[PDB]
Design a protein around this ligand. Structure first.
Ligand SMILES: *[C@@H]1O[C@H](CO)[C@@H](O[C@@H]2O[C@H](CO)[C@@H](O)[C@H](O)[C@H]2NC(C)=O)[C@H](O)[C@H]1NC(C)=O
Ligand SMILES: *[C@@H]1O[C@H](CO)[C@@H](O)[C@H](O)[C@H]1NC(C)=O
Ligand SMILES: *[C@@H]1O[C@H](CO)[C@@H](O)[C@H](O)[C@H]1NC(C)=O
Ligand SMILES: *[C@@H]1O[C@H](CO)[C@@H](O)[C@H](O)[C@H]1NC(C)=O
Ligand SMILES: *[C@@H]1O[C@H](CO)[C@@H](O)[C@H](O)[C@H]1NC(C)=O
Ligand SMILES: *[C@@H]1O[C@H](CO)[C@@H](O)[C@H](O)[C@H]1NC(C)=O
Ligand SMILES: *[C@@H]1O[C@H](CO)[C@@H](O)[C@H](O)[C@H]1NC(C)=O
Ligand SMILES: *[C@@H]1O[C@H](CO)[C@@H](O)[C@H](O)[C@H]1NC(C)=O
Ligand SMILES: *[C@@H]1O[C@H](CO)[C@@H](O)[C@H](O)[C@H]1NC(C)=O
Ligand SMILES: *[C@@H]1O[C@H](CO)[C@@H](O)[C@H](O)[C@H]1NC(C)=O
Lengths: 1003, 50, 93, 49, 50
């Protein structure tokens, strides 16, 4: 009789659908993970299914007894099982055995035993649903009896059509663990075979909810959107105006004398509160037959017509008082309509309608030569004629058409006077309750119903306005119907919750950001069980942080500053640190760096770096074609005919998709085919020290791709939908890449503006230095080193893509987006769309075509909306990829076919060159750039006053190393002695501010 | 098209679907043979005209 | 609202102002070079000389009319403060 | 909610699109304003010609 | 149906406006990388005039 935790037990097969290596998210009555489990012949209640794990090898457990009271009314189920085969008798008995051959089978009785069935760590799911008792058995005979915190699926053992009521269950004895099941959501991982080897809960932990959302068992480091939190309502209040009992009740309901029973009173109950339910206590109402509405209280609804009636009748005659009834009252006094929705209230009135000498005063009509209709009054006082001779007076068969009730005190219930109120429509039952404030509560003010928080209002109403709206047109303020007070309707707090995780592999601790909510408010809601995301992150008193984005109860804030890793919001970011925990910090926008500006202070670098950076661009998208008829209609002629009435929707979608496909073809055409002729690289392969092995084609393999191209390609990976192959095969795209690169590395950039003009590669690089304000003399002066630098840089690139698996994020995102779109499109084929089923074939061979037309139309509308949404999404993504492909074509026409002067366009620095590399549905640009380095502080002066005249550098900058004044290039330290060929003169030495005296030597 | 299947149905599963919820395997109890349901071939036709 | 939520931007307005200040300070102290590597200091009348050289105007003119140009700039920026302040349609987009 | 449950992953698609738009806005401001490596301060006190 | 069509219209409008603002933000990034972080020679790209 201890309490333990069910680690991961209680996973059974929900359906007989085989699935292979999938992740299926299903909601069903499961055993929640880590729930409280009773380890144990007491009476155990059967709460909508039980997980029973009996662990014994002595066979003490001899089955089960099932029932509610065992009083020979319910079918008491007796189950026995020795080792494999189960004997099941759904009997009905008072008692079981408990009020060699170590067996006792006495029980108490075998009456109405409708059905009998035959078939160590024995676990059983017992469920009762859809008239089926379902037993799921996992008979894994482990060697021992200790409870193992392990995993094992439960196969469906038996389903029995009982259709009975069960509330309790006890175990036959001649240990075990018991747990209860709840309706939860579970992500089941079927393995290759149909073996659900793993199950992930969804109501436990923030971590095991992002897994449910992403349909995966390993989540990557980041912030994940998930379910939305809301503070649930705490109470419910319904308020009504001051209950005006003043309806024509007491004078009508409590009058000593009425008129004739056939001549009912016009008891018009209008423009008042029909609260006649209190009068139930004034008189002992016996025949209370309310056929349409039965109010024990009635104070809300306003109605036009009541047609209330007053009657005086006997006791054993109410059988004729029913909707659509026939009899003396219906055919002579008053006919009750078939749809008679009202209260017939007859009460005995011996104490106020009886007298000692006889109360011969209340006449009722017994004879009439006409039939009453609903909502009619009979006024005809003529004596009924039942004979051929004319009827005048008594004597022959001519009775007075009114019989007087002989009301006596000694008569029985069937003859005692009943005074009757008939409510016969062609208010609303609820008693007003106290008003709460400052609590998220449901409100029903005077029929206006909603949920929210009611506070004090400073809004002044004119003394006729009840509601209160805004430009949003929502009820903002309501005035109390009862106390006549005004109060606003501030809604209950709500928002999104997000889960910040460092990845499944790294750790399992997580953080939760309740977006846009006060930490005090969320903590209070947590305290008084008010949050909908039932899982509570364990509050420690320091693991709660407040920020403009919301309340982050998953981590501690640190006054330190670091670069953003997982963006939280409002600058705050979160990251894992190792002790090991998640921390939240204000994002550090890099290091603070003050440049030591001065009147005369310049810095010219004395060295540089030939950097190579990767620039990945999507260029294309998967060409998809959808057959509208086959997708919408599973080759059904009736569905095709119905679809034909919707105009040219299929034609429109086909036109849009074909346009998208030809746009993809033109995108890759414009990007990769800007070269007239395929250029061939020379066989010598020597390029002045530059390597070009990882970018030139490698003939010693198929597809003739470069090694970097090979890494790029190896790094990136039914129902009318068809993926049309691209016009340009990847071999052809590689051939264009090779031609472009060969023209770049042999003829330079000249091949893009005309015929290719050969030029030695060092000369081309010298001119590319000339293009960024660096004299060509640098390159020759540092050729080898520069080459080695390039040879090093490209090498790192080969590792940079290899080491980092997230480098090709954009292309993989494009591919995954297209795959997700197609997967959603095919998955909504299983959407019922508010119809009978999601398969046309079943609907056809289940319903006649006139009725099946409605369901087919609903499915057609749903699938057509799905198709239109997919087509519009594809059009938007096609426009986005068209912009990206135009950018890629611009880069290839400027970065590759030339050197671009636009800053940060063809690389992060002074652009030198670029090399294209084909990639799945995209291009990768290797941008080779010049990044200066090894700075040197210097003193500068805008001019030089030598011969009484100002001198300015032709293209250099005047610097000084403290003693001598030189002029140097403004991007690479190369001091030079100032001469006339090196400076130009303009005016005398007065206008220039920072002019400095010096000597300008003539050569 | 109903062809011999290598998918090991445990002896309680009647149908067999895929991630797209399309029945890619069935077995009739009379034959008790697991067979896949790869659909009838289709696609599109396109006319090349000069 | 009724399920709508306005998520605040990740970069707070203070951080965006700090980026603006950093870009402007690098532009006015180190010139154009801070975007192509380490920021290299240079006096502003020299960076303006470079920028005149970049539009086919020899730098001498700048120095030859330094102060005047400053006042022109000092005037122009002033009008901006009025131009946005007076016209309410300036920030139309 | 139960009636909406039969309409497939419409809500999931809308939520994914909106989150994509949000991260796109964040990336937009990141690309526009964060092209600088290090925060640069103005000189303590100085004019600029 | 009505409310979900309203949501879809709103989301599509937001997607189109997001594409427009993405183009505008790309232009702004190009300007700051070519008009601020350097002097651009493109005509009438960084203002009316040289
Ligand atoms: C350019 O670099 C590549 C890669 O280093 C050189 O190719 C071979 O690289 C392997 C190591 O990966 C060495 O063991 C070989 O000796 C290298 N050369 C040969 C002939 O296979 C390539 O040789 C370099 N370029 C030139 C022109 O030598
Ligand atoms: C599936 O069952 C077959 C039965 O022969 C077995 O060989 C195979 O390994 C099983 N696969 C898995 C992943 O359980
Ligand atoms: C109607 O009620 C009045 C008293 O208000 C009573 O005198 C009269 O006889 C009643 N008639 C009927 C049909 O109840
Ligand atoms: C009328 O009120 C008296 C008390 O004053 C009560 O005894 C009697 O039963 C009531 N009759 C009805 C029909 O309300
Ligand atoms: C939360 O409520 C308290 C109430 O005193 C208030 O002081 C605090 O500023 C609020 N916080 C936020 C984030 O609005
Ligand atoms: C630059 O020169 C001006 C000229 O008046 C002077 O005011 C300023 O202090 C100088 N800056 C220095 C010395 O850093
Ligand atoms: C520049 O740095 C490289 C290493 O990156 C070094 O080999 C070279 O000698 C340096 N040049 C100068 C001028 O210091
Ligand atoms: C600036 O250069 C001078 C020499 O010209 C040097 O003394 C000083 O330390 C430098 N300041 C720096 C690098 O911040
Ligand atoms: C400045 O450069 C000249 C040129 O060689 C050299 O002779 C002198 O020693 C250098 N002085 C300083 C302080 O750098
Ligand atoms: C430069 O020399 C001239 C005389 O040759 C002198 O008048 C002038 O003041 C000097 N300028 C400086 C800045 O020393």
């Amino acid at each position: 009789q201890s309490y333990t935790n069910s680690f991961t037990r209680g996973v059974y097969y929900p359906d007989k659908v085989f699935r292979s290596s999938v992740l299926h998210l299903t909601q069903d009555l499961f055993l929640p993970f880590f729930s409280n489990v009773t380890w144990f012949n007491p009476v155990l209640p059967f709460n909508d299914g039980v997980y029973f794990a009996s662990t014994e090898k002595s066979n003490i457990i001899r089955g089960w007894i099932f029932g509610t009271t065992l009083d020979s009314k319910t079918q008491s189920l007796l189950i026995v099982n020795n080792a494999t085969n189960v004997f099941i008798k759904v009997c009905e008995f008072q008692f079981c055995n408990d009020p060699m051959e170590s067996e006792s089978g006495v029980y108490s009785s075998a009456n109405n035993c409708t059905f009998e069935y035959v078939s160590n760590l024995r676990e059983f799911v017992f469920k009762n649903i859809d008239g089926y008792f379902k037993i799921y058995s996992k008979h894994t005979p482990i060697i021992g009896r200790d409870f193992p915190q392990g995993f094992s699926a439960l196969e469906p053992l038996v389903d029995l059509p009982i259709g009975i009521n069960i509330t309790r269950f006890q175990t036959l004895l001649a240990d075990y663990y018991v747990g209860y099941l709840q309706p939860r959501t579970f992500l089941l991982k079927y393995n290759e075979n149909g073996t659900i080897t793993d199950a992930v809960d969804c109501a436990l932990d923030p971590l095991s909810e992002t897994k449910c959302t992403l349909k995966s068992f390993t989540v990557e480091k980041g912030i994940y959107q998930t379910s939305n939190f809301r503070v649930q309502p705490t109470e419910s209040i319904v308020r009504f105006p001051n209950v005006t009992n003043l309806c024509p009740f007491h004078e009508v309901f409590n009058a000593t004398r009425f008129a004739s029973v056939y001549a009912w009173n016009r008891t018009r109950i209008s423009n008042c509160v029909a609260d006649y339910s209190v009068l139930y206590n004034f008189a002992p109402f016996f025949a209370f037959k309310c056929y349409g509405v039965s109010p024990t209280k009635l104070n809300d609804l306003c109605f036009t017509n009541v047609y209330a009636d007053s009657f005086v009748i006997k006791g054993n005659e109410v059988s004729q008082i029913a909707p659509g009834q026939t009899g003396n009252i219906a055919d002579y006094n008053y006919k009750l309509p078939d749809d008679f929705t009202g209260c017939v209230i007859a009460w005995n009135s011996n104490k106020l309608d009886s007298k000692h000498s006889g109360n011969y005063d209340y006449w009722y009509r017994l004879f009439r030569k006409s039939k009453l209709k609903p909502f009619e009054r009979d006024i005809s006082t003529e004596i009924y004629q039942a004979g051929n001779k004319p009827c005048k007076g008594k004597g022959p068969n001519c009775y007075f058409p009114l019989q007087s009730y002989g009301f006596r005190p000694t008569y029985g219930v069937g003859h005692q006077p009943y005074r009757v109120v008939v409510l016969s429509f062609e208010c609303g039952p609820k008693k007003s309750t106290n008003l709460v404030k400052n609590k998220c509560v449901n409100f029903n003010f005077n029929g206006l119903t909603g949920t929210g928080v009611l506070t004090k209002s400073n809004k002044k109403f004119l003394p006729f306005q009840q509601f209160g709206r805004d430009i949003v047109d929502t009820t903002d303020a309501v005035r109390d119907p009862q106390t006549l007070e005004i109060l606003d309707i501030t809604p209950c707090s709500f928002g999104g919750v997000s889960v910040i995780t460092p990845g499944t592999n790294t750790s399992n601790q997580v953080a939760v950001l309740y977006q846009g909510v006060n930490c005090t408010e969320v903590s209070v809601a947590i305290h008084a069980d008010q949050l909908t995301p039932t899982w509570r992150v364990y509050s420690t008193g320091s693991n709660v942080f407040q920020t403009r984005a919301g309340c982050l109860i998953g981590a501690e804030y640190v006054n330190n500053s670091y670069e953003c890793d997982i963006p939280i919001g409002a600058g705050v970011c979160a990251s894992y640190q190792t002790s090991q925990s998640i921390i939240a910090y204000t994002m550090s926008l890099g290091a603070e760096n003050s440049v030591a500006y001065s009147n005369n202070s310049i810095a010219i670098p004395t060295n540089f770096t030939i950097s190579v950076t990767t620039e990945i661009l999507p260029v294309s998208m998967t060409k998809t074609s959808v057959d509208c008829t086959m997708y919408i209609c599973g080759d059904s002629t009736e569905c095709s005919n119905l679809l034909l009435q919707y105009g040219s929707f299929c034609t429109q979608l086909k036109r849009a998709l074909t346009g998208i496909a030809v746009e993809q073809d033109k995108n890759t055409q414009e990007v990769f085919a800007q070269v007239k002729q395929i250029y061939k690289t020379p066989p010598i392969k020597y390029f002045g020290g530059f390597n070009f092995s990882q970018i030139l084609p490698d003939p010693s393999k198929p597809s003739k791709r470069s090694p970097i191209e090979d890494l790029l390609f190896n790094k990136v990976t039914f129902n009318g939908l068809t993926v049309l192959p691209p016009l340009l095969t990847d071999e052809m795209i590689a051939q264009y890449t090779s031609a472009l690169l060969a023209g770049t590395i042999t003829s330079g950039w000249t091949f893009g503006a005309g015929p290719a003009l050969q030029i030695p590669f060092p000369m081309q690089m010298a001119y590319r230095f000339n293009g960024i304000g660096v004299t060509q003399n640098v390159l020759y002066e540092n050729q080898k080193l520069i080459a080695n630098q390039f040879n090093s840089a490209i090498g790192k690139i080969q590792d940079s893509l290899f080491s980092t698996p997230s480098a090709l994020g954009k292309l993989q995102d494009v591919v995954n987006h297209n795959a997700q779109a197609l997967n959603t499109l095919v998955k909504q084929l299983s959407s019922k769309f508010g119809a009978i089923s999601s398969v046309l074939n079943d609907i056809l061979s289940r319903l006649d075509p006139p009725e099946a037309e409605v369901q087919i139309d609903r499915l057609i509308t749903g699938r057509l909306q799905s198709l239109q949404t997919y087509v519009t999404q594809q059009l938007i993504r096609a426009a986005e990829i068209r912009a990206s492909a135009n950018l890629a074509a611009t880069k290839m026409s400027e970065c590759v076919l030339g050197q671009s002067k636009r800053v940060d366009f063809c690389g992060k620095g002074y652009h030198l060159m670029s090399f294209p590399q084909s990639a799945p549905h995209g291009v990768v640009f290797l941008h080779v750039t010049y990044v200066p380095a090894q700075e040197k502080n210097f003193t500068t002066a805008p001019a030089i006053c030598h011969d009484g005249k100002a001198h300015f550098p032709r293209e250099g900058v005047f610097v000084s190393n403290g003693t001598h004044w030189f002029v140097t290039q403004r991007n690479f330290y190369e001091p030079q002695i100032i001469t006339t060929d090196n400076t130009f003169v303009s005016g005398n030495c007065d206008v220039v501010i920072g002019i400095v005296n010096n000597t300008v030597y003539d050569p």
